[PDB]
Amino acid sequence: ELDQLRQEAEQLKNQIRDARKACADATLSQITNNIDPVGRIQMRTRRTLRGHLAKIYAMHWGTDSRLLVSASQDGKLIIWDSYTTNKVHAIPLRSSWVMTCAYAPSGNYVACGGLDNICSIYNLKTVRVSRELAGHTGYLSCCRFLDDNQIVTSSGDTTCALWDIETGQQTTTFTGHTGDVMSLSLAPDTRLFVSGACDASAKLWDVREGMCRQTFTGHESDINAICFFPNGNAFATGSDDATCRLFDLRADQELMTYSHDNIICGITSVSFSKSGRLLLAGYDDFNCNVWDALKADRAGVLAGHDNRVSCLGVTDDGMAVATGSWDSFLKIWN
Amino acid sequence: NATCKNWLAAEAALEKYYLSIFYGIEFVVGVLGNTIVVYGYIFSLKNWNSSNIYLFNLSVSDLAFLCTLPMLIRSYANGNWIYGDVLCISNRYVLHANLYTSILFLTFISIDRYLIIKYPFREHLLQKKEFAILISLAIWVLVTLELLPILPLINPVITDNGTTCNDFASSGDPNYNLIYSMCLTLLGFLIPLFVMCFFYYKIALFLKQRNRQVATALPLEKPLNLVIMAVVIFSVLFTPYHVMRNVRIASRLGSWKQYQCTQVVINSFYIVTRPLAFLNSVINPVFYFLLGDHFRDMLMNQLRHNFKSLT
Amino acid sequence: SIAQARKLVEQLKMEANIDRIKVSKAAADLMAYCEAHAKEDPLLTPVPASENPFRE
Amino acid sequence: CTLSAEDKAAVERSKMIDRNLREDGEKAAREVKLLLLGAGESGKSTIVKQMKIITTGIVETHFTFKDLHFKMFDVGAQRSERKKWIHCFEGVTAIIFCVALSDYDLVLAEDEEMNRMHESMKLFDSICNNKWFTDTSIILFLNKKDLFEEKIKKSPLTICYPEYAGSNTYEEAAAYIQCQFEDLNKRKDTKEIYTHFTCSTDTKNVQFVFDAVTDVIIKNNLKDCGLF
Numbered sequence: 003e004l005d006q007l008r009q010e011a012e013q014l015k016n017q018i019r020d021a022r023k024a025c026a027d028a029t030l031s032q033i034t035n036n037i038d039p040v041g042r043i044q045m046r047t048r049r050t051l052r053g054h055l056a057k058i059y060a061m062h063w064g065t066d067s068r069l070l071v072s073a074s075q076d077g078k079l080i081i082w083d084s085y086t087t088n089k090v091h092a093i094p095l096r097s098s099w100v101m102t103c104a105y106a107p108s109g110n111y112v113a114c115g116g117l118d119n120i121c122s123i124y125n126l127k128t129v130r131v132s133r134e135l136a137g138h139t140g141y142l143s144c145c146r147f148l149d150d151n152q153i154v155t156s157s158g159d160t161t162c163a164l165w166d167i168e169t170g171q172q173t174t175t176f177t178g179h180t181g182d183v184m185s186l187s188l189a190p191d192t193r194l195f196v197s198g199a200c201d202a203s204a205k206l207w208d209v210r211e212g213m214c215r216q217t218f219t220g221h222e223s224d225i226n227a228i229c230f231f232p233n234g235n236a237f238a239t240g241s242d243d244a245t246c247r248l249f250d251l252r253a254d255q256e257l258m259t260y261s262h263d264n265i266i267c268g269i270t271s272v273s274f275s276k277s278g279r280l281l282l283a284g285y286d287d288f289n290c291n292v293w294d295a296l297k298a299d300r301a302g303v304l305a306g307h308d309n310r311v312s313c314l315g316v317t318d319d320g321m322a323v324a325t326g327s328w329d330s331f332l333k334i335w336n
Numbered sequence: 337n338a339t340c341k342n343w344l345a346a347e348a349a350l351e352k353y354y355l356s357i358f359y360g361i362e363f364v365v366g367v368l369g370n371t372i373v374v375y376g377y378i379f380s381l382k383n384w385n386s387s388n389i390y391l392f393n394l395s396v397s398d399l400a401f402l403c404t405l406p407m408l409i410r411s412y413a414n415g416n417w418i419y420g421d422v423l424c425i426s427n428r429y430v431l432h433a434n435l436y437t438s439i440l441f442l443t444f445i446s447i448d449r450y451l452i453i454k455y456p457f458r459e460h461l462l463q464k465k466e467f468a469i470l471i472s473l474a475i476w477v478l479v480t481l482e483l484l485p486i487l488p489l490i491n492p493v494i495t496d497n498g499t500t501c502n503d504f505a506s507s508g509d510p511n512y513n514l515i516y517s518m519c520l521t522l523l524g525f526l527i528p529l530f531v532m533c534f535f536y537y538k539i540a541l542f543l544k545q546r547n548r549q550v551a552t553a554l555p556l557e558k559p560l561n562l563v564i565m566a567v568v569i570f571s572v573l574f575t576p577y578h579v580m581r582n583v584r585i586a587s588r589l590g591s592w593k594q595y596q597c598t599q600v601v602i603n604s605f606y607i608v609t610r611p612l613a614f615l616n617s618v619i620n621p622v623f624y625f626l627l628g629d630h631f632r633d634m635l636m637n638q639l640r641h642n643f644k645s646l647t
Numbered sequence: 648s649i650a651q652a653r654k655l656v657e658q659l660k661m662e663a664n665i666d667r668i669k670v671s672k673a674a675a676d677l678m679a680y681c682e683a684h685a686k687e688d689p690l691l692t693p694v695p696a697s698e699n700p701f702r703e
Numbered sequence: 704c705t706l707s708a709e710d711k712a713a714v715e716r717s718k719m720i721d722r723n724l725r726e727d728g729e730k731a732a733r734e735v736k737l738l739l740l741g742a743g744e745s746g747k748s749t750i751v752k753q754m755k756i757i758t759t760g761i762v763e764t765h766f767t768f769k770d771l772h773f774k775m776f777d778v779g780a781q782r783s784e785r786k787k788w789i790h791c792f793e794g795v796t797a798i799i800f801c802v803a804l805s806d807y808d809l810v811l812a813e814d815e816e817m818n819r820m821h822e823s824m825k826l827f828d829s830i831c832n833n834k835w836f837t838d839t840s841i842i843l844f845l846n847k848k849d850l851f852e853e854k855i856k857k858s859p860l861t862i863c864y865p866e867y868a869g870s871n872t873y874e875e876a877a878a879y880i881q882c883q884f885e886d887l888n889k890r891k892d893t894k895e896i897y898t899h900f901t902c903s904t905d906t907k908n909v910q911f912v913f914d915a916v917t918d919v920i921i922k923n924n925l926k927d928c929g930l931f
Contacts, residue, residue: 007652014659021663026670033674040691048701053721055728056794068700075791076731078724085700088717092724099761099791117781117788119760140783141760158783178658182783200784216662224787233680235673253673254665277688279681296681320689322701336693336701387928449928456920457733546921553895553918559930628929 030257034296043302045335054330060103061313073103115142137172156183174212185228198225227272240269260293276320284311340597356413358611363405366618370399373621380638389468394441398617401434417501421492424501436524437479443528450535510588577613580606739777741801742823746846754909805850807863828887848902
């Protein structure tokens with residue numbers, strides 16, 4: 003019956019809100035008010051990578067902490083060696099509309115996708131297109147490797163999928179979201195992952211069962227980026243309302259909001275540090291802001307790009323930070 | 337009056353005040369314009385192309401030419417050259433070399449403007465940013481080589497214990513100076529003028545022909561007016577100076593008239609004409625850079641940026 | 648959309664037994680983790696140039 | 704020896720790669736990129752079939768006309784959200800917008816109130832006045848030139864336009880629609896609209912596209928040279 007179901011979910015929503023409020027005895031700011039501030043963060047460009055002839059839309063580091071991969075909307079996927087400027091590879095794509103990029107943990111494969119609704123997997127230790135997965139009905143927004151034979155993707159059809167590169171089939175589909183899923187992040191143990199969509203929502207998915215575990219709200223606009231805390235018990239989200247927010251899993255609610263005046267642009271990407279103290283977020287003002295994750299204070303600013311900051315990453319050992327931009331330049335900061 | 341005694345006083349008045357004040361105003365205006373143009377061409381321009389190389393070289397040549405006036409302005413205000421002989425020699429040499437390099441860069445700007453209309457995607461040998469640097473270096477070296485023969489003529493006169501470093505047209509033997517001036521006006525002014533006129537005529541003809549394909553759109557009228565104005569300004573500002581310099585040099589040949597008063601007339605008109613040819617170095621920055629909407633808008637946008645850093 | 652409403656209510660029901668903890672405990676755990684790895688973060692505490700792979 | 708043995712080889716490889724990249728760029732700058740847009744059932748398939756020479760989401764069509772290479776991009780299956788991927792097409796040379804002239808007197812068949820002509824007007828207004836498209840020209844195609852003539856003698860144009868005042872013929876009514884569509888532009892100083900009345904049996908559309916693209920290229924070059 004319509005009444006037996008409608009108007010009854012609101013009761014459960016009210017119960018959930020009451021339960022969340024009943025456990026908010028204090029705030030993170032109150033706890034951290036007695037901690038010495040980090041101070042001033044000063045990073046200077048050390049390497050500039052050139053060769054792309056159009057906007058750079060995605061990038062990824064890889065567990066090696068030395069090699070880097072970048073994708074731009076000119077039909078090229080470039081693999082650089084960061085310690086120098088030498089280019090290790092330049093893969094020509096069959097489609098010039100790319101939006102994602104991934105580097106396999108083992109370093110043997112690479113992934114790409116975009117407006118063609120297809121995920122292409124290239125083999126490096128053979129260069130040669132290894133696989134082509136086509137199940138989605140919308141543009142690919144993100145893709146992250148689990149193993150050399152598993153990958154998780156999200157599309158603009160409000161869906162995410164866990165694949166099987168060996169057979170090319172779709173192993174599992176994660177449904178229940180409403181807007182276009184724009185980003186996802188894998189937990190360090192690769193047992194759960196968080197996905198943020200354009201409906202100002204984020205969801206926690208369990209890979210082994212394909213069922214939604216928790217839903218987080220609070221943003222006032224679309225969510226463009228997401229990142230897991232290094233310890234795996236919290237994450238951060240950036241949206242189009244020029245604000246970042248930190249959510250935790252066990253408490254199941256928001257912890258802190260990183261926002262400031264004279265900031266009216268959306269956040270394109272977020273990332274943490276090796277210890278989680280800092281939080282780096284790139285904005286549409288072609289700059290990056292480094293916030294103190296425990297105080298919501300702007301610890302530092304990274305400037306040097308011209309058009310926009312679309313991709314941002316931190317090496318697995320925390321040595322440097324790589325930022326891409328819409329002017330086709332990648333910069334390394336230390 | 338028309339007496340020779342008033343003309344004799346009139347050259348003193350013209351060489352003392354007219355030249356000094358006109359050079360003073362020209363120096364300030366041109367230096368400010370070229371400094372604004374040079375700023376934002378290196379700190380705000382990326383992905384240079386053949387046209388930008390030529391335009392930047394023209395601006396640099398204009399700035400170098402303008403950096404020379406102050407010493408001559410004081411010396412004309414004071415009436416005597418108090419600096420060393422080498423200083424005036426280098427000043428005159430750099431002035432003339434920069435003038436003729438500017439002429440050559442204008443000619444190559446016209447050539448590039450024709451090439452861009454003929455090859456819209458820049459698929460030509462002379463349109464890539466490697467021939468431009470070679471052409472600029474060749475222009476500089478060839479202009480210096482062409483102006484080298486000037487040194488034996490422009491030497492200071494040691495008389496009355498005061499070294500007088502007089503202008504190019506009045507110094508040196510009349511015959512050698514006349515032949516060198518007639519060769520320099522032919523090589524450095526007339527050939528470039530004809531090449532520029534030919535290429536701008538081709539560009540105007542193309543623009544007029546392409547205006548009939550305009551079915552319903554803004555017509556190509558402004559570029560045609562600017563193309564005509566470039567040649568008009570160049571010819572009008574440069575022809576009188578080169579016409580009068582040779583006449584002044586020949587009037588010193590003696591047998592032409594063997595008259596002294598005629599000489600004073602000819603010299604007064606040359607002196608009045610000297611700064612008209614120099615006005616180009618101040619006119620160019622506005623006519624080639626600031627008149628363009630794109631360059632002006634970019635310069636203003638990059639001027640408001642970084643203003644908060646230094647204000 | 649009876650099926651859609653039923654699925655939504657079922658999802659909401661399953662999303663109600665997380666056995667949440669207090670915010671203070673989570674904040675303390677985050678602070679402890681952040682303070683335990685302070686010296687292992689080159690970005691937070693820059694290392695000397697003798698051991699910086701991206702020198703100059 | 705500094706930078707010797709494998710390192711040298713590595714550098715060599717990089718240089719070679721760079722060379723290839725540059726080559727590709729020089730090949731990719733000689734192609735005219737057009738973005739094909741339409742309200743829906745606007746007779747754009749016939750437009751594609753007209754200039755046809757030589758998956759889902761993006762559809763690419765390459766052709767050549769008078770030593771000029773055109774690449775047309777069609778986004779018909781991309782129905783997720785325009786705001787999230789429109790900026791990918793910021794550098795296109797022109798936008799070919801197709802509108803059917805025979806849908807003025809027929810309703811959208813859905814919502815019982817939307818009018819197809821009004822939907823096309825809304826889409827054109829949204830696309831024309833966009834932050835990503837401020838200096839990009841629009842080639843407007845008005846298809847169904849025969850159905851409009853056949854229907855204008857029976858159904859008056861006042862059905863779609865309550866404020867229309869004039870005769871009821873093929874002419875003096877298509878001009879009204881063209882003026883209505885052109886009046887949505889708000890940047891006439893920096894943008895141009897090329898309107899053509901396309902017929903299902905006309906093979907001259909490619910000529911109009913070529914003329915408009917050449918005009919756009921020439922004006923862009925003149926603006927770069929400072930003349931504009």
